[PDB]
């Protein structure tokens, strides 16, 4: 047990009268009062948990060495993927440690870059007009996610007066007349609501004319009967059709409404009246499948869909004859079609995920015929933003040992052969001393689970190495082995082995992989992660007390469920912003959007599966189980912010209180010696560095792993 300085756990009050009935099952909730973040008693708790946490971290002598290495390894120039508008190319750049990326512009491909906007004096949703004369961007005013959109002129970097409030994730979609754009804002604030405490409902699709106030924007769609339905939108590369996509919750499923802009007399000004919604052709009007438009030749559209294709495919339909849908690129029986991109007037780039590695195909657009195939090494290719009219395609490659390469491919003039456009370099790190491999590991039920393992070349499998394992396992999210500077520090200066596990609930083998780890089958996700740890131990990478596990949000749920079920297997656990009360999550902020993956304790069958793994309801003293008297919980750090509208911090607080009660303060001479603490952020690159240095310092101490120069 790494930690020797004894622990003074603070008193935490239990309300023994709070009890709820779930279909005849009585569940006590003695920390109900921790659900209010503003009360005197909750603020005292925060203060008491901060004092305990600081005292344990002061014993962790490698925090400072970690912090300086992270800073040094992350301090290198980085280029984003370039995109084209008119004859200008745009990209982001960071020298290394700038708090935000700087936005650059150049005249030709061989042109000299100039600074167009430097925020270093938070910013998302950058979108350049068709003629390259304007750009729209979002500023973050608060602690909440709300964004304000402003527009600049690229010629002199001057602002327009236009200010658009109440945007979240919707970028500006510009019409080809350069007069304005479509976007999807939430309504203005009403009586009784407050900027801090407003919900995000009743989303709208609007058109904004440049040089006007938000209150003049044309209303194209809203639905007051279905307040939770949310929106994304798009315009076709030819400029003729506005596409509106309507979604419900977390599912990979959407509606598709199409508006023919060429049929409107006097453009978007026709709707000045409201008459409240525009005359959309409602091509798809249910939530049965995912649809994303890839191209159109007049009224003939190509779409990517999961309709009777859990690995996805490309289909074609004529809007003038919408009963008839025809396969263009058939579903593969082994590989997921992750994305598709129309390029160079008549070509398609398809990005496949094949045993959790990318493969790129280049095809003919009209026929679907295969022209070239490029398998990619262990890592991830992403960010293809080229449009159909563009002849140069760019994308980014990243991996555990590759900080970032941007590749360039002139499909017109010098085709087939990827040239490096920019390559990032980690300073003072010899990449050739390390390697990454993939193995497939059997889960409890026999299913094979792919995991990646990164380690120093030529190590002995003698059980001696500290090991960190990461996973997520939900929502159809594909977990790729990308670059992290702090992970390099763990590998080099702690002698570590890193493992990424592609457990079920992800999307890696399509929709069947997602469904085998959601709702009634969520327990499969935990079993998959436990199996991976058992493999790392039996194959001789590490041992039980030298395994750390880490994850965030749904990944934090992952960590907490796994330590409740198999505490013997782990020496350290770090849960960042986890969903910990699975009976009550849907009651707070936007947690109601996660019922599609988790179920909801409102329905009796869904309760019965939730109660078995809910973290705050399954904390149990491992030493009281008759064969494992020598087991305790791993040293545990729960990470959160004291205020967080994404995953409310009551989740973390209630768990922390439950663990400290059950394992430490309910009994007189507890075998639990490993510390159970929270690292609480009150209220940016340097903030993030300090969080990660704390977590790795605590990890080194807990696993009794010394520093190596």
């Amino acid at each position: 047990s790494g930690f020797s300085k004894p622990l003074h756990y603070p008193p935490v009050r239990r309300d023994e009268t709070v009890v709820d009935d779930y279909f005849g099952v009585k569940v006590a909730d003695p920390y109900r009062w921790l659900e209010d973040p503003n009360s005197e008693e909750t603020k005292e708790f925060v203060d008491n948990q901060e004092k305990l946490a600081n005292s344990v971290l002061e014993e962790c002598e490698l925090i400072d060495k970690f912090k300086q290495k992270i800073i040094d390894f992350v301090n290198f120039p980085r280029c984003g993927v370039p995109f084209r508008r008119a004859n200008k190319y745009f990209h982001f750049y960071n020298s290394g440690l700038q708090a935000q990326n700087v936005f650059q512009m150049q005249d030709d491909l061989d042109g000299k870059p100039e600074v167009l906007y430097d925020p270093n004096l938070g910013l998302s949703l950058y979108s350049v007009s068709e003629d390259a004369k304007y750009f729209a961007f979002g500023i973050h005013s608060g602690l909440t996610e709300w964004v304000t959109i402003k527009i600049l002129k690229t010629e002199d970097r001057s602002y327009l007066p236009d200010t658009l409030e109440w945007v979240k994730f919707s970028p500006a979609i510009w019409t080809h007349d350069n007069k304005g754009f479509f976007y999807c804002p939430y309504p203005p604030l009403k009586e009784g609501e407050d900027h801090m405490t407003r919900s995000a409902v009743n989303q709208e699709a609007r058109y904004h004319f440049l040089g006007t106030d938000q209150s003049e924007d044309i209303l194209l769609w809203r639905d007051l009967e279905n307040p939770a339905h949310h929106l994304k939108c798009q315009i076709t590369d030819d400029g003729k059709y506005f596409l509106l996509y309507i979604l419900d919750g977390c599912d990979d499923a959407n509606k598709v409404y199409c508006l023919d802009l060429t049929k409107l007399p006097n453009g978007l000004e026709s709707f000045r009246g409201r008459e409240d919604s525009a005359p959309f052709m409602k091509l798809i009007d249910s939530f049965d499948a995912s649809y994303t438009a890839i191209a159109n030749d007049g009224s003939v559209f190509t779409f990517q869909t999961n309709k009777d294709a859990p690995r996805k495919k490309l289909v074609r339909v004529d809007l003038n004859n919408p009963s008839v849908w025809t396969d263009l690129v058939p579903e593969s029986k082994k590989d997921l079609l992750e994305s598709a991109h129309a390029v160079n007037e008549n070509q398609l780039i398809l990005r496949y995920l094949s045993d959790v590695k990318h493969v790129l195909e280049i095809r003919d657009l009209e026929s679907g015929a295969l022209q070239h195939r490029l398998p990619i090494d262990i890592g991830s290719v992403d960010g293809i933003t080229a449009r159909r009219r563009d002849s140069v395609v760019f994308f980014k490659f990243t991996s555990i040992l590759t900080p970032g390469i941007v590749y360039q491919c002139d499909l017109k003039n010098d085709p087939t052969q990827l040239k490096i456009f920019r390559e990032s370099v980690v300073p003072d790190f010899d990449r050739s001393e390390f390697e990454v491999k993939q193995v497939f590991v059997p889960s409890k039920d026999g299913t094979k689970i792919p995991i990646f393992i990164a380690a120093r070349k030529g190590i002995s499998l003698d059980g001696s190495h500290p090991c960190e394992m990461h996973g997520y396992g939900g929502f159809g999210i594909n977990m790729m082995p990308t670059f992290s500077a702090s992970r390099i520090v763990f590998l080099k200066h702690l002698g570590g082995v890193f493992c990424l596990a592609n457990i079920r609930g992800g999307g890696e083998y399509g929709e069947e992989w997602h469904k085998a780890g959601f709702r009634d089958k969520k327990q499969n996700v935990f079993d998959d992660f436990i199996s991976a740890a058992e493999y790392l131990i039996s194959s001789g990478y590490t041992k039980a007390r030298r395994v750390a596990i880490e994850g965030g949000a749904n990944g934090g749920l992952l960590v907490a469920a796994c330590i409740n079920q198999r505490p013997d297997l782990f020496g350290c656990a770090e849960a960042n912003c986890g969903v910990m009360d699975m009976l009550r999550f849907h009651k707070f902020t936007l947690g109601y959007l996660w019922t599609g993956d988790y179920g909801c304790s409102d329905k009796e069958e869904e309760f019965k599966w939730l109660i078995k793994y809910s973290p705050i309801h399954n904390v149990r003293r491992p030493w009281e189980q008759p064969g494992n008297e020598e087991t305790q919980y791993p040293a545990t750090m729960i990470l959160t912010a004291d205020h967080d509208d994404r995953v409310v911090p009551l989740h973390s607080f209630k768990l922390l209180a439950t663990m400290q009660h059950v394992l430490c303060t309910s009994l007189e001479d507890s075998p639990q010696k490993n510390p159970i603490i929270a690292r609480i952020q009150r209220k940016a690159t340097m903030t993030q560095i300090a969080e990660v240095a704390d977590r790795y310092g605590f990890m080194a101490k807990a696993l009794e792993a010394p520093w190596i120069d």
């Binding site: 984003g80 960071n94 950058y126 960010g383 670059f483 992290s484 500077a485």
Partner: peptide
Amino acid sequence: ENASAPV
């Protein structure tokens, strides 16, 4: 495109 720092 506009990526946070890979900490």
